[PDB]
Each structure stands twice: as C-alpha cells, then as structure tokens.
Ligand binder design. Structure first.
Ligand SMILES: Nc1ncnc2c1ncn2[C@@H]1O[C@H](COP(=O)(O)OP(=O)(O)O)[C@@H](O)[C@H]1O
Length: 904
C-alpha cells in the first residue's frame, strides 16, 4: 500500500470533485435549461444544531459545522432543502482547499446511497470510477482502517437507501467504531428515525431566505423573467412560503420559462403545473403510435412500484427499454448519461417520482374503472404500519391527497383504520430512558413512550395531508374519524402554518384528540403560539404542557398561560428548571377545571406554591425534584394527606428532618390510591424511615412500585418491610438500593430475602448493602429460582467475590433469566480471571440493556478486554455500559466502543 498510491488516489478524487462534470448539474434534467454550479450558483444556507428533543440549539454555517464535526454527523430537512448539494459542496471545498476544516482529510468520498450495492469497495469503485486498478478490496479496507479519521465519507439520501442491498455501508454508518472513518449522512426529517440513535451531531438545513431565493432566481433566469416571477412571488403568499425550499424555487423557475402566468397554491400544485406543462410542451415529440395515455399510465405505475419497492433507479433489461425511452422523449424521466452496465433511468428528483406516483394513485382511486380503483385500494392496502406511512409513504400521500379530494377521502378513511405501529426504533426523545417526563411517569414501559411518540408523528402526517388536501371543512367527517383518540405535538418555538389551518377549519378534530402536548422553551410568551391558540376558540380533552428554562416571568406571561391552560378540561404540567415560578403556581393555574399531574423539577417553590399543590385534591400524580427550602406547617409534606386521589408520588432531594419524615409518614397513611412511590435522596432524616415504611406496608395496598434510595433506610425499616411485605402483593418493582444497613443489617436483609416469595409479579429487585451482604447471595438465588421473569437485578456494594461471581454464574446457567434487562454489580471484588469466567454466561443474556461493573481502581488483563469487546458485540440491546475504575487510557479503548454510551 504505497504512499505514492494513496496520493494517486487522493489526486483522482480531487480531480473528480474539481471537474466541470461534478461542479455542474441539471437539477430538473438535461431537457430543461437550468444549470446549477457548486461554486457559482450556491448560496450559503442556514443550519441548525439539533437537540435530542428536536429543538434547535444553535445557528450554524457549513464552515462552522465542518469545524465542529463529530461522527456520525446527520444532516436533515424536508425534501428539496439542499442536503445533497451540501454534500457536493463539502466535497468541492475539500478539493478546492477552500476550507481549512477539511484540510485534515486525506480522502473524501462522495456517493449516492441509492446506488450502494455489493460492498463499500464495489460501491466506491463503480460510482467514482477513478479508483486505481491495483488497489484491492482487502488492501483498501486495511487502507481505510489505517487512515483512521483522515477519511471523510459523504453519504447521500439514507431515505433512498435500502440497507439490505449493501450491509457494509449500513455498518459504516451504524457501527462507526469498527471503521473509525468519519461519516456524514444525509436523510429526510421523515426518515431520520432510521439513523437517529447513531448520530453524534445532528444539523438541519434551514429555509431559504428571500435574498438567497432571489439570488438563485436571478442566476438561472433572464432579468425580465426574474422580475416577472418575483412579482408573482410577492403577490401570492403560498408561493412565498414555497420559496423557502430551493428545489421548489428551481421548479417555479422552470415553470416560468415555459409559462408566463401561473397560480400554484400548494407544493402538489407546483408539481402538477410542472407536469402538465411538460406534457403540453413535449407531447409533440411522440410520433410513434396510436398510445400517449398508455405511456403516462406506465410512468405512474413505474413511480408507484418504485416507491413501494424502494427503487428510485430503473433499469429494464436491454432492448426492453421502449416505454422508458418514450418517457425520456416526453421528459417525465431521465436516463443516466454516464456509462452504466445496462440502461438506467430516474426522475429528476425523488420528489417528482413521489408526485408522479401520487398523481397515479389518485387517478386510480378516483377512476371510473372498478379495476383501477381496486388496484389503487390495493396500493393503499400495502400500507399497514404507521412507521412505514410517516417515513416511506408520507410524501406519496401528500401528493395523492394534494391531487384530488375524493382521493383524500380514501386515504383518510384508510389511515383512520390503521392499528399497527411498526418499528419503534429511532423514536426516543431522551437518553437511555419515570420522573424524566409525564410521558415516563404516566407510561408503564419504554415501548409505551415510543408508541406515544409514534402517534404524535402519525397525527402530524395527517395534518399535513389535511393542509395539502385544500378542503377547508369539507372532509371534517373523515378527518375527525382519523384524529380521534390520538395525540398532537406542538412546539411553541416552532409552529407550522398547517397547525393554524387545523385549528381554524377543524376545531372538532383538535377536541377529538385524547391530548395535545405543548412545549415552551425559554419563552413563556412565543407570540406565534399565542396567535395559534387565541385566534379561534378551542376545547381540549387534555393539555400536556412542559415549561422549559423559564427564568423570567411577567404579567403578560402569567395571564396568557392562564388563558391557554383554560382551553383544556384536563391539564398535565411539567415545570423544568424554571426559576420564574415563585408565587406564580397559584396564579398561572388560577383557571383550571382539572390538573391531572404535576411535575416540578430543579425549580424553587415558595410556601404559597406548596400550599396550592396540596390545595388541589384531584391530583393523581405528583413529582417534585429538589426542594431545598425548609418545611414549615401548612407545607407540602405536613399536609400531604390532602390529596387522597394521588396514585403516584415522587419526592426527590427534599430538605427534611426526622420530624418532617414522621409527618410524611402520617401523610402517606391517607393515600389509599398509590400504585407508585419514590422517596429518593433524602438526607438527615433520622430513623424517619422506620415510621415511613410502617405507614406504607401496614395495610393491604395497591402499590406496584417502591423506590426507597439514598433516603436514610434503617435495618429496622427493612425488617418492617419484610414483616409487612405480604400487605403489598402487587409490587412488581422494589428498589431499596443505595442504602447501608448499619446494625443487624444482614439479619434484616436475609429476613427480607426470605419474604420475597410473597411477590409473584416482581420484575425488579435492587438491594441495599451491609456488612457480610455477599453471605446472603446463595439465599437470594434460591428465592430467585421462583422468579424467572426478573427484569432488573442489582446488588450494589455487596462486594461480590469470585465465589459469589461463579455462584451467580452457575445460578444464571442453571436458572437462566432470559428477560433480565439490567444488571448492577458495583463495588465488587472480582478478579480479571473472575470476570473472564463470567463473560461466558454474561454473553447469553441478550435482553440486557444496562450493566454496571464499576469498582475500585482496577486494571483488566488484556485477555479480559478482548472478551469484553466480543461480548459487547454479541449483545445488540446495550443502551448503557458503566465501567468506572476500569483502566482504559491508551490501549484497549478503540474496540470497546459501541452504539451504546460508555462510562469510564
Ligand atoms: N445553497 C443553495 N443555493 C441555491 N440553490 C440550491 C442550494 N442548495 C440546493 N439548491 C437547489 O435546490 C435543488 C435541490 O437540491 P437537493 O440537494 O437535490 O435537494 P435535497 O436536499 O432534498 O437532496 C438543487 O438542484 C439546487 O438547484
């Protein structure tokens, strides 16, 4: 692998990216005169750094993004936003030397992910064509690995990518640690779920500014046509909105070249104007036969099957290209000029394939031939799961509904019938996910959270379809059937125009939603949100609102929030890191029929607020985090008994003392509905837990979750818990962890372990620690023989030794836990050989999400590490790996990386 050869490779890539062929392309195809140049026609876009919650953190430039690069980096936006051109721009900048950020890269490869087949080498070789003859697939792979992060891959259109065709590139994106090259991946917002978990940086391509839009217009158009078109843009609002995306700008430019005056109100109508214009101009070239319509039908079917088969390139066998060729003559599709093994065709953009397919689908559904309608409904029947619908079929239905009203009837009638989620993969809004959100608190499982998100996205798709349908109130019957029992997500910082249409023309659907989730970021009063909610009178079953980082609150903010909260019969409220809520909890909530749940997190609360919280007796869920204000009479915990309907209580980091703990105990006696209790991180409450535990377990209970952690738990309280454990039968979750039992600790703990048989449904056990805890390990395992469904197990600071570690291993082999999701063994005494033995059984729990092996400073033998990486490969479901005190500095770290987050 001579360095000469590497330089010849780099020179070839640079030659390709610097050629007029790479620099210039026809956006709309070779048969329409518009030419885009990566250097000259390119206007700098605005980009946004993205937060897990899909909120925009920071504004960026391409240069700043390249400067800040972390891999994998994901660039997202709606179709036609300019992402592909962004990648081509990066490639061109690297060649030019024009960018300092890219100077670190020895090699940059740009490929369209759509044409990825075979393996990485074959794809690069076949696409780029400039790869030296004597560099071979193994030699090339070794070259990339050796070259490390000095290689930049620009991968375009993951939405156009079917990963089974090329698993190697899929791995290049998804497992980047094996490769250690840098990757930048392009995808739509719709399909972002597929790559979301993988990306270390996420940026969105923003809308196109009027200056930039007209810059593009002026470039590709003659001046008369430039001002004529611009007048048309400024006179119509819809066109102005359509001009925020560059592709549509190019398309209207093309329309303007053909047509003097045009009316398109929707992006579907833009495409329709263009298509109709194409037939009008180019119909005359077909001199061949008696059928034009048969050819158009062929095009529509080509696009339709294309979307469903995920095939955006069309290669018929050689000699059979006749219909495709006729379609090239008309200009509906383009054939690849570059030399291909066989003739290959495509639509100028994916969105045009989607439009042609939508026009075809609508034409089938609205057809006067029962057969065609049957085929169209058959196409609809291919859409089962919402996952496929929002991502794969989303644009298909946008143009389908956009084309005809009758078609929206069929589509909405179908979507209302859809019970299937599909893939829940990329939906997570948190990091390795109760207490984190209402969504975590109110939902029993993570899957439920993901499903909830999926429904939000499904509904947004539905509203998009609603706006494109352009039927104001006419379809309200069909639409309400769809939206009913579903949920809507609204970000006050980002409000789409179709939300206004939805609220305006369809108030019944907004009321038919089970709930609306409202998010406020840093501002209690965006004005656009105010406009959205106030303009028309809405009524909501439930409003779920989260107030984020609001440290400034005034009268306008409070009164306005009151008006917004009054829109719903039920209200669920989360206050996160809000320093502006002091006296204001009572005033903000002044008009509420029902407040269902309240979450206050890392926010200061005065005695007035505490009093108001206990004042509302209808509260079924209460979670407060970090109250450092001392408790007085009339306080939060003094009268906790006021809320008798509370089914979930979470108290975290509460300033309390022994008497406060006793008052809390007396209060817990009065809550008969509690199925969830978390008392966590309570310090200085002396013996308060003896009192607290008694009140909980004294009587027969509905309690299904108890987390007592870092609160001061006494061995007496654990003994009481053991004695009264028969009173809480339904408990599936017991976390007593992070507690030391001082005296009679092992006796009390064994006493508890002995009474574990009482709990039939117990899926989670987290144990406290004491002197000689490990001696209780055999006893615990016998109890666990009758607990095959244990999801979470931990013994923290039990100091397990090799005898205990093999004991647990043998237990695991004989009595396997096949559902065990996470294992916490912390502060253990395990030899490197000891862990090495354990890796054998450790390999076979595949449902393991999280494991903590942390300990006192410990150097794993390398032989242990080899197996560490290998077992980590065998476990696909790892979300979190926590190894603390393990020494990996120079040597073993490179192989230990994974999709999961690792803590060292
Ligand atoms: N920075 C830019 N300035 C001006 N026009 C642009 C810019 N980026 C893209 N365009 C135009 O928008 C069209 C669509 O770009 P493309 O990247 O294919 O869409 P997508 O982002 O969906 O892949 C291009 O043909 C180009 O003419």
């Amino acid at each position: 692998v001579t360095e000469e050869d590497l330089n010849v490779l780099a020179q070839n890539l640079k030659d390709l990216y610097n050629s007029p062929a790479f620099l210039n392309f026809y956006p709309l195809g070779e048969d329409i005169d518009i030419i885009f140049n990566l250097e000259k026609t390119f206007t700098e876009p605005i980009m946004w750094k993205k937060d897990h919650r899909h909120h925009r953190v920071e504004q960026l430039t391409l240069g700043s993004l390249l400067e800040a690069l972390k891999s994998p980096c994901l660039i997202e936006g709606e179709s036609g936003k300019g992402k592909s051109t962004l990648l081509q721009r990066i490639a061109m900048l690297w060649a030019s030397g024009g960018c300092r950020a890219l100077k670190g890269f020895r090699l940059v490869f740009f490929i369209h992910l759509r044409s990825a087949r075979g393996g990485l080498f074959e794809t690069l070789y076949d696409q780029l064509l400039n790869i030296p003859d004597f560099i071979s697939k193994p030699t090339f792979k070794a070259l990339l690995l050796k070259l490390h992060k000095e290689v930049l891959f620009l991968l375009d259109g993951y939405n156009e990518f079917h990963p089974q065709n090329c698993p190697e590139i899929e791995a290049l994106i998804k497992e980047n640690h094996r490769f250690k090259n840098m990757v930048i991946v392009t995808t739509t917002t719709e399909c972002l779920r597929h790559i979301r978990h993988v990306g270390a940086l996420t940026a969105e391509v923003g809308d196109m500014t009027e200056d930039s839009a007209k810059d593009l217009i002026e470039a590709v158009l003659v001046p008369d046509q430039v001002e004529r078109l611009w007048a048309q843009i400024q006179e119509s609002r819809c066109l102005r909105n359509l001009m925020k995306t560059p592709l549509f700008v190019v398309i209207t430019c093309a329309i303007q070249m053909g047509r003097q005056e045009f009316q398109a109100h929707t992006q579907t109508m833009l495409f329709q104007t263009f298509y109709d214009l194409l037939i009008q101009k180019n119909s005359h070239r077909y001199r061949g036969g008696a059928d034009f319509a048969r050819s158009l039908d062929y095009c529509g079917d080509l696009a339709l099957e294309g979307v469903f088969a995920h095939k955006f390139d069309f290669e018929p066998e050689h000699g059979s290209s006749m219909n495709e060729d006729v379609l090239v003559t008309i200009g509906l599709l383009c054939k690849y000029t570059a030399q291909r093994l066989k003739p290959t065709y495509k639509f100028f953009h994916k969105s045009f394939q989607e439009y042609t397919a939508g026009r075809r689908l609508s034409s089938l559904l609205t057809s006067k031939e029962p057969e065609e309608v049957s085929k169209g409904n058959s196409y609809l029947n291919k859409m089962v799961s919402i996952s496929d619908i929002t991502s794969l079929y989303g644009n298909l239905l946008l143009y389908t509904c956009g084309s005809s009203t009758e078609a929206t009837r069929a589509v909405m009638r179908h979507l209302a019938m859809v019970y299937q989620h599909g893939s829940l993969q990329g939906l997570s809004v948190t990091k390795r996910p109760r207490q984190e959100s209402i969504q975590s608190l109110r939902n029993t499982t993570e899957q439920d959270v993901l499903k909830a998100i999926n429904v939000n996205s499904f509904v947004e798709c539905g509203i998009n379809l609603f706006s494109e349908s352009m039927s104001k109130s006419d379809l309200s019957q069909e639409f309400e059937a769809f939206f009913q029992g579903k949920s809507l997500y609204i970000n006050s910082e980002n409000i789409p125009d179709y939300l206004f249409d939805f609220f305006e023309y369809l108030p019944n659907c907004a009321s038919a939603l089970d709930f609306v989730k409202l998010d406020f970021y840093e501002r209690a009063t965006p004005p656009r949100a105010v406009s959205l909610f106030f303009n028309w009178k809405q009524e909501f079953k439930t409003l779920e609102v989260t107030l984020r980082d609001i440290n400034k609150l005034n009268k306008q903010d409070i009164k306005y929030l009151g008006k917004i909260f009054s829109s719903a019969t039920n209200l669920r409220l989360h206050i996160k890191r809000c320093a502006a809520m002091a006296g204001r909890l009572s005033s903000v909530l002044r008009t509420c029929k029902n407040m269902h749940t309240l979450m206050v997190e890392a926010s200061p609360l005065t005695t007035d607020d505490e009093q108001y919280i206990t004042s509302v007796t209808g509260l079924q869920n209460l979670s407060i985090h970090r109250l450092h204000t001392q408790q007085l009479p009339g306080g939060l915990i003094d009268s906790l008994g006021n809320l008798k309907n509370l089914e979930r209580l979470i108290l975290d980091d509460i300033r309390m003392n022994e008497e406060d703990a006793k008052n809390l105990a007396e209060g817990l006696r009065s809550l008969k509905k509690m199925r969830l209790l978390h008392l966590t991180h309570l310090s200085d409450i002396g013996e308060g837990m003896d009192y607290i535990v008694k009140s909980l377990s004294e009587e027969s209970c509905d309690l299904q979750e108890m987390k007592l952690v870092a609160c001061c738990l006494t061995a007496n309280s654990v003994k009481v818990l053991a004695q009264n454990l028969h009173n809480l039968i339904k408990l599936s979750i017991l976390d007593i962890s992070e507690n030391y039992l001082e005296k009679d600790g092992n006796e009390a703990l064994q006493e508890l372990i002995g009474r574990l048989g009482v709990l039939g449904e117990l899926t989670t056990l987290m144990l406290p620690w004491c002197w000689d805890v490990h001696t209780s390990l055999p006893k615990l395992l016998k109890q666990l023989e009758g607990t095959p469904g244990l999801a979470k197990l931990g013994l923290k600071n039990w100091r397990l030794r090799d005898e205990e570690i093999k004991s647990l291993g043998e237990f695991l082999e004989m009595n396997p836990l096949r559902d065990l999701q996470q294992l916490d063994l912390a502060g253990h005494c395990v030899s490197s050989d000891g862990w090495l033995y354990f890796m054998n059984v450790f390999e076979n729990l595949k449902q393991l999400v999280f494991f903590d092996f942390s300990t006192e400073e410990f150097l794993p033998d390398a032989a242990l590490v080899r197996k560490l990486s290998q077992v980590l490969s065998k476990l696909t479901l790892l979300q979190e790996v926590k190894l603390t005190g393990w020494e990996f500095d120079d040597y073993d770290i490179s192989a230990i990386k994974g999709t999961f987050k690792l803590v060292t």
